[PDB]
DNA sequence: GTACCCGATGTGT
């Protein structure tokens, strides 16, 4: 149905054009841009799935400036809000918001200039906790809606919605209310990360029943998909040399599981002369605006360390390698954080470090939600299952994996194949540790189960179970992994007359060990 | 037996 959408003659159409060249300063439209605006501007509900730097802002930014009265955005952080506002401003958008950094003074200007009787403001940011706490606002929008000046709703990042509203941001449930209290009022959600399950759990939640979908190919043509195994305790080293020999000079991001993590890798990279920066929640926002300025800039922070609260509002282009230090808790938050390198389509590497000691740990900080049921709960479980299972599967290409996942089928198998420089683990000393690895605690559970049975028949007949068989023959035989006498008796150290005396002890299970 | 342990925002007088 999008080629209605995809026209030039609307009654909006010129003023549209005329704002997309001189108040935005751009030239051409971009893939889905031109269809989702016209929709948007045709009072339509819609969906949008377009990658991260695919020009979502402007699919709301310029309907917001053609449509009369004020469009709401709903935005999760408020540093998100203040740079978005800002960027608007210095291209003389007229934009505000009202979050809990503006004083009361300035928040009545607002809200007097939204009572005037052309509101000019164009873009009100708001968090959901303040649409679910204000009065004034509630009321100001009630206003609005009486004289028809209520524009849009719009809901930037709306995995968000299905993210942290069932169960720590409740508030993007208990927003809903707009949707009773406005209900004319059309909503637009945007959003470069959800696999068929979180697209409808978005539209439920969002109050959504008929939307236009706009959506895009989830692969990311530049991005090697890397997992390797996981050194608890050398782990920091490991990423560091990775990164000293693969990424002297680019920069980088290090997601770690806790805010100790963080700070180990950074002391780490630190000691051996690596710009790494930690950055936590336990910082505070004056050292974290201060280490983020670091990282952008480039100077004295090559790498920056960080828990999940770090990269939502992140615009870099040149991060070239992304280290998740712990498997992410979903695939989705893996995709997103991941994707947070190669903005700029140069070759990129995403590396992840895999153990299911880590699953516990995820697991622990699962169970430990404050307002989780069992429902949130086993929904946290499944994706952390899916992630493990992406991670310990070392057959499928991760680039099919991930499209499978996000529900996109029709892709090309051969992709990691025809352009190998962005080539997956998977598809370029790999599976043949597994097969060491298996025989030697083979022959451990071997040389355990000979050495009890020593200790017993020397326990039978009154001597040490070294004058049976001593340390080193017991540990040829383990390693032989065999039963037949005739290759027993090819070891050192085993006799024949040894072999008479205590044969049917000494073979008891170990021939049953003949399968390694 | 015990230490482990991510992440937002939020006001009319
Ligand atoms: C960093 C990122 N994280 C995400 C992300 C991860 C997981 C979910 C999710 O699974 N949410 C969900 C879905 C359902 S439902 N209705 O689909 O069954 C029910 C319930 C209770 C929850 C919590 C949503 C978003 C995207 S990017
Ligand atoms: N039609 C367009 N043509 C060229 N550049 C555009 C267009 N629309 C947006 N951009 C640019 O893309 C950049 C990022 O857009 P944004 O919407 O933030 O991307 P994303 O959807 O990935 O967040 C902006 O700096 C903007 O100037
Ligand atoms: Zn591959």
Same mark, same amino acid.
């Given at each position: ?14 003023? %549209? ?32 799935? %377009? ?98 000046? #209520? ?31 406005? $209900? !004319?009022?059309?909503? %637009? ?21 008929? $939307?236009?979908?706009? +959506? %895009? +190919? ?111 808790? !979903? ?16 070759? +990129? ?70 352009? $190998? ?15 060491? !690895? ?11 189960? #000979? ?31 065999? !039963? ?33």
């Amino acid at each position: 149905k999008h080629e209605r959408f995809q026209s030039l003659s609307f009654p909006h159409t010129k003023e %549209m054009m005329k704002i997309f060249h001189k108040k935005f300063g751009l030239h051409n439209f971009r893939t889905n841009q031109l269809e989702a605006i016209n929709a948007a501007l045709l009072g339509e509900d819609c969906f949008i799935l %377009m990658p991260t730097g695919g020009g979502k802002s402007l699919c709301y930014q310029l309907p917001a400036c053609v449509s009369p009265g004020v469009t709401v955005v709903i935005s999760p952080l408020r540093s998100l809000i203040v740079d978005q506002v800002q960027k608007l401003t210095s291209l003389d958008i007229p934009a505000t918001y009202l979050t809990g950094d503006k004083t009361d003074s300035e928040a009545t200007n607002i809200y007097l200039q939204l009572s005037k009787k052309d509101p000019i403001i164009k873009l009100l940011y708001v968090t959901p906790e303040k649409i679910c706490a204000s009065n004034r606002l509630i009321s100001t929008l009630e206003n609005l809606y009486e004289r028809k000046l #209520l524009a849009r709703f719009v809901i930037d990042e709306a995995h968000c919605v299905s993210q942290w509203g069932h169960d720590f941001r409740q508030d993007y449930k208990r927003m809903n209310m707009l949707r009773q209290k406005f $209900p !004319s009022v059309p909503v %637009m959600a945007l959003t470069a990360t959800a696999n068929p399950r979180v697209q409808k759990d978005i539209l439920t939640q969002l109050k959504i029943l008929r $939307p236009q979908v706009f +959506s %895009m +190919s989830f692969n990311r043509h530049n991005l090697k998909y890397y997992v390797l195994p996981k050194k608890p305790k050398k782990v920091a080293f490991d990423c560091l040399e990775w990164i000293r020999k693969h990424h002297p000079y680019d920069s980088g991001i290090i997601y770690c599981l806790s805010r100790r993590e963080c700070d180990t890798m950074a002391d780490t990279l630190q000691r051996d002369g690596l710009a790494a920066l930690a950055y936590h929640a336990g910082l505070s926002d004056s050292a974290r605006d201060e280490v983020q300025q670091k990282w952008i800039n480039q100077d004295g922070c090559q790498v920056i360390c960080a828990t999940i609260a770090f990269g939502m509002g992140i615009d870099k282009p040149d991060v070239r390698f992304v280290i998740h230090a712990s498997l992410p808790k !979903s695939v989705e938050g893996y995709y997103q954080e991941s994707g947070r390198a190669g903005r700029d389509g140069e070759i +990129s590497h995403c590396l992840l470090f895999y153990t299911y000691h880590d699953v516990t740990r995820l697991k622990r900080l699962i169970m430990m939600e404050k307002d989780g049921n069992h429902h949130t709960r086993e929904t946290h479980f499944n994706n952390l299952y899916s992630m493990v299972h992406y991670c310990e599967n070392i057959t499928e290409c991760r680039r099919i994996q991930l499209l499978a996942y996000f529900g996109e089928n029709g892709f090309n198998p051969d992709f990691c194949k025809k352009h $190998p420089d962005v080539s997956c683990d998977n598809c370029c000393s790999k599976a043949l540790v597994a097969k060491v !690895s298996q025989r030697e605690e083979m022959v451990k559970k071997c040389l355990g189960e #000979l050495t009890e049975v020593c200790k017993s028949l020397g326990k039978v007949f009154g001597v040490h179970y070294f004058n049976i068989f001593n340390t080193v023959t017991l540990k040829k035989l383990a390693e032989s992994l065999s !039963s037949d006498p005739e290759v027993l008796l090819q070891i050192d150290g085993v006799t024949e007359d040894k072999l008479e005396k205590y044969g049917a002890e000494v073979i008891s299970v170990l021939q049953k060990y003949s399968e390694w």
